[PDB]
Each structure stands twice: as C-alpha cells, then as structure tokens.
Design a protein around this ligand. Structure first.
Ligand SMILES: *[C@@]1(=O)C(=O)[N]C2=[C][C]=[C][C]=C21
Ligand SMILES: *[C@@]1(=O)C(=O)[N]C2=[C][C]=[C][C]=C21
Ligand SMILES: [Cl-]
Ligand SMILES: [Cl-]
Lengths: 187, 187
C-alpha cells in the first residue's frame, strides 16, 4: 500500500517549499494530498504563485491518518499554520501515533506554536532560529536536514530537495530515494 | 525600470521548473508574468500540482516585449510548447530583438521545434539530448547551466536554482543574483 502525505497549504506559504516536496514525493509513488488550510480555494503563496489545493484541510483531515504531515515554510504561511486549531489537532494526532512530522524554513515554528516534538533536535532557516528557540524547548542544529524522534526539519528553499528526499527515505527507503534523486540532476 | 519576464505555462510543465524561476525572479524584483498557453484557466502540471496563471498567453503577448522568455520543462509541457504557433511567434520576436531566451530540462527542445537559436551551445536534461541534437543544429554541453548568444539553458529540476540565478544575473547583474542567493540556503 502506498504511503500517504498531507501537505498543509496556507496563504503566504513558500511555493518552492510546497511544490518541491509534493513533486518529489509523487515521483516516489507517495499519495500526496495538498490541503488548503482556508478551504478548497486557490492559495496565494509568498511570491504570488497561486496553487489550487487538492482538497480543503477540513476534508483531508477526515481521510487520515497520514504517514507524514508536511509543513512548508514562508514566514506568513508558518504564521497561518501556527494560528490554526485544525493544524494543532492534526499534529497532536500525528505525534500521538508516532508518525512522521516534517517542516521546513520557518515551518518548524508552527511546531513550537502547537507544542509538538519538544526535546527534539531541529533546524530552521537561520532567520527563524531565535523564534524556534524561544524557551529552549528544542535543541538547535545547523544541519541542512535534521531528524530526531518524530521530527524532520530543514532550512530553506535551497535545502528543499534534500528535505523531500529525506521524507522519501523515511517512508519508502533509501533505494527508492536514490532512484528518485538521479533523474533530478542534483549536485 | 524593472525587468520583465514571461514564463509560458503549458499542461504537463514540470512544476518545480516553473515555480523555482518564478519565485527567484520575483525575489530579484523582476516583474514576472506566468502566462497560460491554453488560456486563463488553471494548469495541471506534470506531477499534478495545479497552478493558476497570471494571464493567458494571448493576453500576455500583447503586453510585450519581455526581457526574458522562459520555457519550463516537463516532457509533455515541452511538447505542448513545441506545437504552439503562438509560442513560435513569441520566440521569433524575442530572437529578432536580441532578447534573452531561457529554457530548462526538455524545454530547449521547443527551441528546436521553432528553429530558434540554431548554432548556439545548449544543454538539456540528459534524456532530452538526442531529441535536441537531431540534425546537429546546436552544439551540446554538459554544463549545469549554459549560455551562448541569446540562449540560456539548463538541465533539470536540480539545476533550477542555478538556472534562475543565471537569469537574474543576466537581467539585474551579478550582485543582485548573489544577494538573492544567500537567503535561499543553497549548497
Ligand atoms: C523560508 O522559506 C522561511 O520560511 N523564512 C525564510 C526567510 C528567508 C529565506 C527563506 C525563508
Ligand atoms: C525534465 O523536467 C524534463 O523536461 N524531462 C525530464 C526527464 C527526467 C527528469 C526531469 C526532466
Ligand atoms: Cl518568507
Ligand atoms: Cl517530464
């Protein structure tokens, strides 16, 4: 059975950090649902790319649970994720079932907001470090991708392929990740 | 005055190769128009990400000319671009005015289709090489980004940041490209 990913798409999300993981995960044969935080309507990302979600979050959450919940960055997207009770509930449920939780750039700051994965080693965008670290609830890392416990984090648009491939590795294994990687012409 | 980019978005385009250049160019302060080949309606990309264009190609072409015309890859997107008379006319006009023409992955094969930039050094995705090289009209390169004459090409999703930053360099200069690069957390 194919693994399943939920990608939560909020206004202000970083579109590169949304599309790279969606695309790479679909290359890996993962069933990905792009779920709109606000509803079924198109979402205006940080640099004005407009993406139409596969479903509302309201609907997607009733088709759970998922093998991974993915939080893109973009500062305003992460703020929107951080303010959402629906997101809080999805993440808590994922944590409780010991499922993978993945977040990139400022995305990890929504984990802080919702009190998810405290005690884990995490990375963020450099400019999001101080926010993430408020209270010392996580241990900070400068690795381009980090993984500790349930929590997989990464730093920025430029680490999005590595982040996505780490998700593929976690779900489908190293060999699939390597096979997906090769045609991409990564460095 | 800000430089202007036209990104032509066809069904089957590689969504990473579409969004990375759009986003990076907008970070560089370039005015980017995402123009739908088929019209104003949302476009289903290769891995099923659905992007809403800023305008139809029909409308965008009347707001030209542009400092760069950008052709994403994705094999079926490039086939759609290659079959379009509107694309042909836009590219011919761009060539005639000695403007930049940029294409990635299989995107450069639409240059072949429309007889654009013959004699230039080009790269493509490795799997698109034989198509591009039919007739020996270009000189092939394995550089991750290549630029010769009017024609800027690149290889795949994994070279999209380098491709986008090369476009920024060409239009706005090396310093702007370097400033845009730094926050991205590239290798
Ligand atoms: C990233 O996408 C984020 O969430 N915050 C930020 C700041 C600068 C560059 C990239 C990012
Ligand atoms: C690329 O996007 C394209 O146009 N053709 C292709 C084949 C394999 C991987 C990436 C690409
Ligand atoms: Cl941002
Ligand atoms: Cl393709």
């Amino acid at each position: 059975a194919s693994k399943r990913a939920l990608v939560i798409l909020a206004k202000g999300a970083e579109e590169m950090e949304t599309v790279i993981p969606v695309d790479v995960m679909r290359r890996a044969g993962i069933k990905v649902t792009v779920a709109g935080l606000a509803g079924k309507d198109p979402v205006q990302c940080s640099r004005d790319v407009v993406i139409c979600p596969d479903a509302s979050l309201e609907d997607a959450k009733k088709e759970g649970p998922y093998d991974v919940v993915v939080l893109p960055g973009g500062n305003l997207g992460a703020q929107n994720l951080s303010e959402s009770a629906a997101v809080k509930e999805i993440l808590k449920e994922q944590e409780n079932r010991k499922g993978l939780i993945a977040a990139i750039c400022a995305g990890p700051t929504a984990l802080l907001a919702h009190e998810i994965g405290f005690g884990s080693k995490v990375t963020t965008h450099p400019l999001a470090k101080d926010k993430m670290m408020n209270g010392g609830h996580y241990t900070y890392s400068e690795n381009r991708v980090e993984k500790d416990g349930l929590i997989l984090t990464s730093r920025g648009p430029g680490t999005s392929f590595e982040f996505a491939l780490a998700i593929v590795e976690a779900l489908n294994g190293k060999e699939v990740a390597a096979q997906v990687k090769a045609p991409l012409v990564l460095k």
